[PDB]
């Protein structure tokens, strides 16, 4: 038992991380087969980032303008192109550590692991959710750009995120691995800001089920509620709507605990209207929304990856 914010083992991604330097900017790249992916703003200078024309900036670059460091081994760049907001650096060596992988784009509300990196050297791993407003509450310092987010499904790494920028509230914005931003953000220095967020209701319910599985039951009750009446309360407290599909997705957890989904919604309703009254759930005094139903099943059943 127990419930931790658990990331996927990072080894398979660690073997792909490289350092990409252009001019005086160094950031991280993802090396898969003979291509290194990195944020295209690597080609920008300080004043370039005020309002950049990336096509113009890139045509003025040369293969030799890109220094790629894989550990203590230089990688020779033999081609370069732009795909949306990422750069694809063609190199003369295919990464022998390339895992089986996919490029997937995730939904707000879904979670992933982040391998935070500096100078192509992994520093730490942690679990994030894609917020409803398409930001992530990460932990990133200068030089972290190009660090990637991912999930692992048996042996295949599904890359879903690459870090580009920090917004003024301290949250983070980036792209999928085809270079398309998550959310209404751009890789230039504007006054862009996150925009209003909501709480991921289905995840809160999943985490309440994890709590029951782990012996926290004080918030339970005999009351029930209807989906429509729950969603009136959700809207009130800035939670997003619960759909029938969410109810279906929570089925396995409902069955394992014996607590009907709508019953647990009644519990959540009471928690929202009354607070916790000094008590905690899974060591938290706040309602946690960055565990999906899948994450809960993973940790409260025990699936591995190879």
Active site residues: 41, 145
115 binds a second copy (CB under 8 A): yes
User: d(Cα 164, Cα 145) in Å, to the nearest integer?
Assistant: 5
The structure tokens 């998550």 sit at 182
End-to-end alpha-carbon separation of the chain, Å?
A: 22
268 binds a second copy (CB under 8 A): no
277 binds ligand A1ASJ (CB under 6 A): no
Radius of gyration of the chain from its Cα atoms, rounded to whole angstroms? 22
Q: For the CB of residue 146, give the shortest distance to ligand A1ASJ in the complex, in Å.
A: 7
User: d(Cα 294, Cα 305) in Å, to the nearest integer?
Assistant: 15
Q: Hey, what are 84's tokens?
A: 């949306």
Choices 37-45, 177-185, 262-270, 292-300 (CB under 8 A): range interacting with a second copy: 292-300
121 binds a second copy (CB under 8 A): yes
Q: For the CB of residue 194, give the shortest distance to ligand A1ASJ in the complex, in Å.
A: 10
The binder of ligand A1ASJ chosen from 176, 187, 240, 295 (CB under 6 A): 187
The binder of ligand A1ASJ chosen from 12, 41, 80, 131 (CB under 6 A): 41
The binder of ligand A1ASJ chosen from 101, 113, 150, 166 (CB under 6 A): 166
HEC states along 118-181? ECCEEEEEEEEECCCCCCECCCCCCCCCCCEEEEEECCEEEEEEEEEEECCCCCEEEECCCCCE
Cα 269 off chain centre by = 28
Interaction residues for ligand A1ASJ, span 217-276 (CB under 6 A): none
118 binds ligand A1ASJ (CB under 6 A): no
Interaction residues for ligand A1ASJ, span 49-88 (CB under 6 A): 49
The binder of a second copy chosen from 49, 82, 126, 220 (CB under 8 A): 126
294 binds a second copy (CB under 8 A): no
14 binds a second copy (CB under 8 A): yes
Residue 207 near residue 289 (C-beta atoms within 8 A): yes
5 binds a second copy (CB under 8 A): yes
User: d(Cα 80, Cα 91) in Å, to the nearest integer?
Assistant: 9
- Helix, strand or coil for residue 255? helix
Residue ranges that bind a second copy, judged by CB under 8 A: 1-12, 14-15, 71, 115-119, 121-126, 128, 137-144, 166, 170-172, 214-215, 280, 283-286, 298-306
């Amino acid at each position: 038992s127990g419930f931790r914010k658990m990331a996927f083992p990072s080894g398979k991604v660690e073997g792909c991380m490289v350092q990409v330097t252009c001019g005086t900017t160094t950031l991280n790249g993802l090396w898969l087969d003979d291509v290194v992916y990195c944020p295209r703003h690597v080609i920008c200078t300080s004043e370039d980032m005020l309002n950049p024309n990336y096509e113009d900036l890139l045509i003025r670059k040369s293969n030799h303008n890109f220094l790629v460091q894989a550990g203590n081994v230089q990688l020779r760049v033999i081609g370069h192109s732009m795909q949306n907001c990422v750069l694809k650096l063609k190199v003369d060596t295919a990464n022998p550590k390339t895992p089986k992988y996919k490029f997937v784009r995730i939904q707000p509300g879904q979670t992933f692991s982040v391998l935070a990196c500096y100078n192509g050297s992994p520093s730490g791993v942690y679990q994030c959710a894609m917020r409803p407003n398409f930001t992530i509450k990460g932990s990133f310092l200068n030089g972290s750009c190009g660090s990637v987010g991912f999930n692992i499904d048996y042996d295949c790494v599904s890359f879903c995120y690459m870090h580009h920028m920090e917004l003024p509230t301290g949250v983070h914005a980036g792209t999928d691995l085809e270079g398309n931003f998550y959310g209404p953000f751009v890789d230039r220095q504007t006054a862009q800001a996150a925009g209003t967020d909501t709480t991921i209701t289905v995840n809160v319910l999943a985490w309440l089920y994890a709590a029951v599985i782990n012996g926290d039951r004080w918030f339970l009750n005999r009351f029930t509620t209807t989906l429509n009446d729950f969603n009136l309360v959700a809207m009130k407290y800035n939670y997003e709507p619960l759909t029938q599909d969410h109810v279906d997705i929570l089925g396995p957890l409902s069955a394992q605990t014996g607590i009907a989904v709508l019953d647990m919604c009644a519990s959540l309703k009471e928690l929202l209207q009354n607070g916790m009254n000094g008590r905690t759930i899974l060591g938290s005094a706040l309602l946690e929304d960055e565990f999906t139903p899948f994450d809960v099943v993973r940790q409260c059943s025990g699936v591995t990856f190879q």
